[PDB]
Amino acid sequence: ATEIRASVGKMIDGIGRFYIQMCTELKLSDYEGRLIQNSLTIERMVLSAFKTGGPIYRRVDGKWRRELILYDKEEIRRIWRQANNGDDATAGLTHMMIWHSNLNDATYQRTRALVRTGMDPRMCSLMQGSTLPRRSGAAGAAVKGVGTMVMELIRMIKGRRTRIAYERMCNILKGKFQTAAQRTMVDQVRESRNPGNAEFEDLIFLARSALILRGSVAHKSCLPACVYGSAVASGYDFEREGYSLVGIDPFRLLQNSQVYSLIRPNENPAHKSQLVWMACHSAAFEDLRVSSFIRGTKVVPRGKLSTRGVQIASNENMETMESSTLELRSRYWAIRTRSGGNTNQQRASSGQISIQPTFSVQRNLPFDRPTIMAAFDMRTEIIRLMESARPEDVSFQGRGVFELSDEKATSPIVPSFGSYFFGDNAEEYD
Amino acid sequence: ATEIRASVGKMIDGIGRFYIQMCTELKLSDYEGRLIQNSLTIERMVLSAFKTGGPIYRRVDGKWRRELILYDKEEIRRIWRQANNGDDATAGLTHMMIWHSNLNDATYQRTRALVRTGMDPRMCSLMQGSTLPRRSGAAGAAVKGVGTMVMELIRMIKGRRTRIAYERMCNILKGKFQTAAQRTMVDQVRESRNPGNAEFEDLIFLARSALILRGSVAHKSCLPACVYGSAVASGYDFEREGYSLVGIDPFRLLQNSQVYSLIRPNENPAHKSQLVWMACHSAAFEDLRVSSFIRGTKVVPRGKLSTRGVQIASNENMETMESSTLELRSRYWAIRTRSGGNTNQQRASSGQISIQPTFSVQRNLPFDRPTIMAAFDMRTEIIRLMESARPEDVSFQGRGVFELSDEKATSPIVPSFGSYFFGDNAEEYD
Amino acid sequence: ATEIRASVGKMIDGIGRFYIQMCTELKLSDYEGRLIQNSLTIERMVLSAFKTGGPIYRRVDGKWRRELILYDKEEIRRIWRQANNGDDATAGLTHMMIWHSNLNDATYQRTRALVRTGMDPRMCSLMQGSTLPRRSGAAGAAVKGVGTMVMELIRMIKGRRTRIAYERMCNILKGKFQTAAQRTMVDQVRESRNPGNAEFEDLIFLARSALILRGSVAHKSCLPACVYGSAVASGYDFEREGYSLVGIDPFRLLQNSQVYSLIRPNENPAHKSQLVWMACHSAAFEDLRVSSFIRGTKVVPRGKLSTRGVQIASNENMETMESSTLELRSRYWAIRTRSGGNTNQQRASSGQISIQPTFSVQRNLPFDRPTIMAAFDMRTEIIRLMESARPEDVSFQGRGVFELSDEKATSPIVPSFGSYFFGDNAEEYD
Ligand SMILES: COc1ccccc1-c1noc(C)c1C(=O)N1CCN(c2cc(NC(=O)c3cccs3)c([N+](=O)[O-])cc2Cl)CC1
Ligand SMILES: COc1ccccc1-c1noc(C)c1C(=O)N1CCN(c2cc(NC(=O)c3cccs3)c([N+](=O)[O-])cc2Cl)CC1
Ligand SMILES: COc1ccccc1-c1noc(C)c1C(=O)N1CCN(c2cc(NC(=O)c3cccs3)c([N+](=O)[O-])cc2Cl)CC1
């Protein structure tokens, strides 16, 4: 924990130094350095470098001006190595990849990718880290949803180091499943000599099962590089303080940070704020109800957002662009979880699914139809298992949100009770 | 379009002239002529004539008085032929039948008819035009719901011109189904030599399928004859202007019209207004949500209506009757559709049916159970097809309501979001 | 009716006299006598006596003091016999047992008992009178839920008077089922020579079926002894007036009564009030919606109650205890029913389960999926029967609540429309 916080704090400290360095190299003002569009281009450069460049936006003469700078990849690689105390440091690089993955997950529906791989486009909640490269870092493997893994494996199915790459990914997915039955099916997909349709079929089944018997996907709050750089510069020492991705740290960092974004004429700056907030806390596929309660303001579905992507294309013109503050703070904080919720146990039930009339009064007599009717080889075990589950079943018992003043997470608030971010479009009202 | 508007405008112009003529024949005042109960009796007469009569209500000495007039059928037939520029004109006659059908559909549940034919009384949404005679006009065929057709065909199943009548009706129903599978079943019902139980069974199946894979039923705004007559008299030329049943025209006509109704002591005049508004725009089986949004005031379920039928029986006494204005205007207008919504395509999905927990917080983890579990000869194709459909699936993409000032339907309003008119009674709370 | 009211009034009159007698024997003040915790201990004594005692709470020196008195069982038995005009009187004894049963049903979830017997812990609505002894009184048999009966029978399955005890209980349960099919299964469980697993399996099936095809369980408003005693003393004659358990009487009795309860520091006195109100009208497993409408204030789920049990354990200290008035009155009253609602008939349907689009507008097209899809040896009859039922189906047609001024129940109020009391806990959100 102390040791984990040590190295995590070491990599964020490295990202910070690099960004500051890069900001002076481009002679950007502090405000300009803290424009989300500038941070992404700088993030893109160091990721691409492992000549290159992209749009860098300057406040010039009361107007926003675009410029596509170019840097030698050898020079960037040097600047990254040296901001990270000599070492090559692939850790912070993958941390900035996961940040981009989270923003992608929050911005774009990847249905076109899903249908090509033979997957149902309603599996987006399984798709964390799908834009993240195949065989990324260990942290990248940790963060990838069940569907991402399944998608990657079918791309394979569609040179004996190909076999080990296949096996590694089978094992990654297996480690994500919380039931032995699902785990046993992955062994059957892995054990296959010369994989094909039966494996494809199996993986589609597993993906669908992961909608109810959800897998263990890690969630890591990853912030634009400018946030870390701004913190280092302002006097914060991530090596002395340590740092965490799943605890209070990132919430408390955003609470002391101010990030900006370029805003188009049609766009609501609050809606841009929601998007980058979601991305920051890897919350694209969270229940909107909890996202709201945590933030303090309503987290609206994608379809009701009066905004488009964070990045401003080379096509559109700068003379209409204004720049707004991003609202990334929260009312409460909550630990980020690796868990997919309850899947196992089935230790009794404890509840009520029908009523017994006491009074002679006209009314309907409510009962939980799917639950009552429900009770009337590894494939059928899974079927029976998800047939047993109910949307009403509670996970994370005893756990709750925390006040920002609660450093040590001592007094959990359990919240009382629109769930899907991608539920509202021209085809479906979910 | 111009040609369609020409003839439609010609038949409404004919109905108009006839009503004016009839109003002078009975020496009725303009107000009296625009009493819905008077219009229906005049409508009844010309329909029955193809001696006869019915109750005609006059404002006499500060009180409402009833009188059952009588006209020779030869004289009425002459008056109809001559108001329609010589010609026999069966078009306007069937237009006044469809108006009566729409009012019937809005007023009376026809469960007793449904059970005799072996049909489920919950199929009322399939029952448009069930009170309309068998083998009416082409417009009558167009307006009949899937269930009406099925009901008519079973009545048959329960003299070789009987065979062609059977075949015509099979083809009418077939032309209504939007899926080839349903269409293929109708061919199997039609092809049958000496039809019986298997056909009955097939038709019950098709009817049930039309609740999810809905058929193409035409909808035509048809107004009481007084509305058209009042318009002709006031200076409107339906031949010069043309006229439409599915566009803006009828909405804009009601906007410039004022209709009255006799009201009983218990009845709410607003609730009478809702009923005749629904009837007018053939909306008895529309979603209450859209009916409301269009009208601007809430369209309440049948069970919550403090009113009975428009027609006042010969039994009840006139001394308690008062007369109220009918409120038939709307906030918005919308094109009337022939479509039954989406049934085909299945081009991907694009949505979200489960959540992936990001935060360690106590809550249930919502998922779309029926949809996820769903994925686990022409009869089974249909079963699989309606098993694939979901209540959340969106039809009429891109289409919306219009401001009354928007003649050419240029700026569609897409509405944001109690659905069943016949959902609330002593047996069921739908 | 007059004869039934005669004897019922006779037993409540007996309970009343006994309580008054007991109150003087303990030299308690009227206020002290009307403390719910005192009444229960006195109720416990006469039930246990058929030496003994329990905690009796006195208001001493501005503080609440506890004392565990002791009485000879021979003396209590004498006091009960003599307050009941000589006779042994087992009737009032079982009436005080049913009162305790109702409070138990309202206070404690009995999942631990359910799981041992192999039953689903979600069957609590079937569990009326489970804490009531096996083979209680006839009134006790009447009041026991389907699940209680099933639980009792499995305890058996897990000395030929054992056979008759088995058969009596099979017949009790049978008399509760409203469908012949369920009744026929009980005959098959009863007819079994040397019962075992097949019977266990059968009874679990029947219990589950009783969640939809609900059985006839009697409900009797039974009040703490202090309420009856207080009434006798104040001048009310239950033999001259008669008395009822299912009519207006108990509501009207509570309306003229004032009961108290000891309250802990954390507890909301209103929430204590809800609990004892529910217990009093045997309403633990009623729909919360009707319980509310009747009472006039919201009847909250168990999980949202800031209270624990009525009885104060010997462990906890008296110096923190305060005493509050219990709010047991109601806005309306309603007859208590023996019925389990509709299970039979299936006389047509009359309703609407889908919509037919009239307007070309973007929206989803709602349909009742489970109902439409539903239509696609005694075990299968039951399956088909509960598959036919719907949560939306209305029972007790024409019946409603009454104003407290409406003695003869002349003007029924039919109510317009959270249902489960035990639906909210750390495992489930129902
Ligand atoms: C205690 O104050 C300081 C503390 C340190 C440095 C400067 C100050 C300081 N010097 O002047 C003022 C004024 C200051 C000040 O009050 N703050 C507010 C908090 N700030 C902040 C806090 C955190 N994390 C956590 O606090 C925790 C994480 C886990 C349990 S607590 C992170 N992060 O981990 O990323 C970033 C930032 Cl920027 C630092 C600046
Ligand atoms: C433009 O005005 C006139 C226009 C014509 C005649 C008189 C006037 C007129 N002369 O004086 C005043 C004052 C007038 C006036 O303003 N109105 C309001 C609209 N009225 C009306 C409009 C329609 N249809 C449509 O407008 C459309 C349908 C499709 C696109 S537009 C229908 N219908 O088709 O059944 C019935 C009626 Cl009654 C006619 C009278
Ligand atoms: C009519 O008044 C009296 C009537 C009798 C005795 C005294 C009074 C009386 N003497 O002075 C005042 C003042 C009085 C008074 O107004 N009440 C209110 C009602 N009280 C009461 C009413 C009932 N039942 C029913 O009323 C019905 C049950 C069914 C249809 S009506 C029950 N119960 O059956 O358990 C308990 C009680 Cl305590 C009795 C006292």
Say whether A396 and B361 touch across the interface (CB within 8 A). yes
Minimal Cα–Cα distance from A36 to chain C, Å? Answer: 36
DSSP code of residue C414: P
Q: Which residues 6+ apart lie within 8 Å of A16 measured at CB? A: A225, A228, A229, A231, A232, A233, A238
Paired residues of C337 in beta bridges:
none
* Amino acid present at A331: R
Residue C297 CA to residue C291 CA, distance in Å, equals: 9
CA closest to C116 among chain A residues: A348
Q: Tokens at residue A14, please? A: 């490295």
**End-to-end CA distance of chain B, in Å?**
40
> With a CB-CB cutoff of 8 Å, which residues 150-189 of chain C face chain A?
none
Number of domains in chain A: 1
Q: DSSP characters for A343-401?
A: -S-------B-B----B---EE--B-HHHHHHT--HHHHHHHHHHH--TTBEESTT--B
The answer to whether the CB of B264 falls within 8 A of the CB of B308 is yes
SS3 content of chain A, % helix, strand, coil (to 5): 45, 10, 45
Nearest alpha-carbon partner for B391 in B367, B415, B419, B414? B419
Q: Tokens at residue A353, please? A: 């699914």
After which residue numbers is chain A interrupted with C–N beyond 2.5 angstroms?
50, 158, 376, 417
Strand spans (E) along A16-139: 52-60, 63-71
Q: Strand, helix or coil at C354?
A: strand
Residue A178 CA to residue A174 CA, distance in Å, equals: 9
The label of the residue with tokens 């009032």 reads: C92
- Put residue B89 in one of left, alpha, beta given phi > 0 → left and psi -120 to 50 → alpha: left
Residue A104 CA to residue A222 CA, distance in Å, equals: 13
How far lies B153's CA from each of B121, B190, B200, C126, C414, in Å? 17, 10, 8, 47, 41
The label of the residue with tokens 């769930």 reads: A419
Minimal Cα–Cα distance from A391 to chain C, Å? Answer: 9
The answer to whether the CB of A176 falls within 8 A of the CB of A377 is no
Say whether A355 and C398 touch across the interface (CB within 8 A). no
Residue A301 CA to residue A420 CA, distance in Å, equals: 7
Nearest alpha-carbon partner for B286 in C187, C361, A89? C361
**Which ligand neighbours the alpha carbon of A247 most closely?**
1
The answer to whether the CB of B174 falls within 8 A of the CB of B188 is no
Q: Residue A38 CA to chain centroid, in angstroms?
A: 21
Q: Which residues 6+ apart lie within 8 Å of B194 measured at CB? A: none
Q: Which protein residue has the closest C-alpha to ligand 3 atom 13?
A: C256
The answer to whether the CB of C109 falls within 8 A of the CB of C301 is no
Biggest CA pair distance of chain A: 84
Size of interface B-C (CB pairs under 8 A): 176
Q: Is the C-beta atom of A251 inside 6 A of ligand 1? A: no
Q: Which residues 6+ apart lie within 8 Å of A62 measured at CB? A: none
CA triple C28-C33-C35, angle to 5 deg: 130
B272 close to C (CB below 8 A): no
For the four alpha carbons of B273, B276, B282 and B283, in that order, the dihedral sign comes to positive
DSSP code of residue C99: H
Residue A383 CA to residue A392 CA, distance in Å, equals: 18
C-chain residues near B306 (CB < 8 A): none
Minimal Cα–Cα distance from A110 to chain C, Å? Answer: 23
Q: Which protein residue has the closest C-alpha to ligand 1 atom 1?
A: A236
**End-to-end CA distance of chain A, in Å?**
40
Residue C75 CA to residue C26 CA, distance in Å, equals: 14
The answer to whether the CB of B230 falls within 8 A of the CB of B188 is no
Nearest CB to B429: which of C353, C369, C417?
C417
The answer to whether the CB of B17 falls within 8 A of the CB of B232 is yes
A184: how many CB neighbours lie within 10 A of its CB? Answer: 15
The H or E element that residue B389 is part of is none
Burial A52-81 (b: 16+ CB within 10 A, else e): eebbbbbeeeeebebeeeebeeeebeebbe
Q: Which residues 6+ apart lie within 8 Å of B60 measured at CB? A: none
B397 close to A (CB below 8 A): yes
CA triple A319-A324-A330, angle to 5 deg: 160
Residue C229 CA to residue C17 CA, distance in Å, equals: 6
Residue B260 CA to residue B38 CA, distance in Å, equals: 10
The label of the residue with tokens 């609660």 reads: A406
Residue C149 CA to residue C155 CA, distance in Å, equals: 10
B-chain residues near C303 (CB < 8 A): none
C-chain residues near B214 (CB < 8 A): 354, 356-357, 365
For the four alpha carbons of B74, B79, B81 and B86, in that order, the dihedral sign comes to positive
Residue C337 CA to residue A360 CA, distance in Å, equals: 5
How far lies B241's CA from each of B10, B13, B16, B146, in Å? 10, 11, 14, 34
Residue B404 CA to residue B401 CA, distance in Å, equals: 10
CA closest to C212 among chain A residues: A367
A248: how many CB neighbours lie within 10 A of its CB? Answer: 18
Residue A32 CA to residue A25 CA, distance in Å, equals: 13
After which residue numbers is chain C interrupted with C–N beyond 2.5 angstroms?
50, 158, 376, 417
Q: Residue A136 CA to chain centroid, in angstroms?
A: 15
Say whether A428 and B354 touch across the interface (CB within 8 A). no
Q: Tokens at residue C230, please? A: 């207080």
Minimal Cα–Cα distance from B417 to chain A, Å? Answer: 9
Q: Strand, helix or coil at C345?
A: coil
Q: Tokens at residue B84, please? A: 């329609």
Q: Which stretches within B120-160 are classed as H helix?
A: 138-143, 146-157
Residue B198 CA to residue B210 CA, distance in Å, equals: 18
Chains contacting A (3 or more CB pairs within 8 Å): B, C
Residue B41 CA to residue A380 CA, distance in Å, equals: 66
| B255 CA distance to ligand 2 middle (Å) | 9
Residue A225 CA to residue A20 CA, distance in Å, equals: 9
Residue A38 CA to residue A58 CA, distance in Å, equals: 9
Q: Which protein residue has the closest C-alpha to ligand 3 atom 31?
A: C407
Nearest alpha-carbon partner for A5 in A194, A244, A209? A244
Nearest CB to C211: which of A354, A360, A417?
A354
Q: DSSP characters for B81-99?
A: HHHTTTS---HHHHHHHHH
> With a CB-CB cutoff of 8 Å, which residues 112-131 of chain A face chain B?
114-115, 120-122, 124-126, 128
A398: how many CB neighbours lie within 10 A of its CB? Answer: 9
The answer to whether the CB of C170 falls within 8 A of the CB of C189 is yes
Strand spans (E) along B49-135: 52-60, 63-71
Q: Which residues 6+ apart lie within 8 Å of C9 measured at CB? A: C238, C239, C240, C241, C242, C243
Say whether B351 and A212 touch across the interface (CB within 8 A). no
How far lies B116's CA from each of A171, B110, B119, B121, B150, in Å? 63, 11, 7, 10, 13
The coordinates were experimentally obtained by: X-ray
Residue B225 CA to residue B235 CA, distance in Å, equals: 16
- Put residue B47 in one of left, alpha, beta given phi > 0 → left and psi -120 to 50 → alpha: alpha
Q: Is the C-beta atom of B124 inside 6 A of ligand 2? A: no
> With a CB-CB cutoff of 8 Å, which residues 314-343 of chain B face chain C?
334-337, 339-341
Nearest alpha-carbon partner for B394 in B414, B413, B409? B414
Q: At B86, phi and psi to the nearest 5?
A: 75, -50
Paired residues of C71 in beta bridges:
C52
Q: Tokens at residue C73, please? A: 């069982």
Say whether C362 and B426 touch across the interface (CB within 8 A). no
Q: Which residues 6+ apart lie within 8 Å of B171 measured at CB? A: B186, B190
Residue C296 CA to residue C270 CA, distance in Å, equals: 13
* Amino acid present at A199: E
The answer to whether the CB of C409 falls within 8 A of the CB of A339 is no
Nearest alpha-carbon partner for C53 in C65, C67, C64? C67
Q: Tokens at residue A427, please? A: 């085809």
DSSP code of residue A42: H
A-chain residues near C109 (CB < 8 A): 350
The answer to whether the CB of C132 falls within 8 A of the CB of C122 is no
The H or E element that residue C402 is part of is strand C402-403
Minimal Cα–Cα distance from A107 to chain B, Å? Answer: 14
**Helices C2-25, C91-107: crossing angle, 10 deg rounding:** 80
Residue B202 CA to residue B205 CA, distance in Å, equals: 5
Q: Tokens at residue C36, please? A: 């719910």
* Amino acid present at C388: S
Domain span at residue C187?
1-430
Chains contacting C (3 or more CB pairs within 8 Å): A, B
* Amino acid present at A179: T
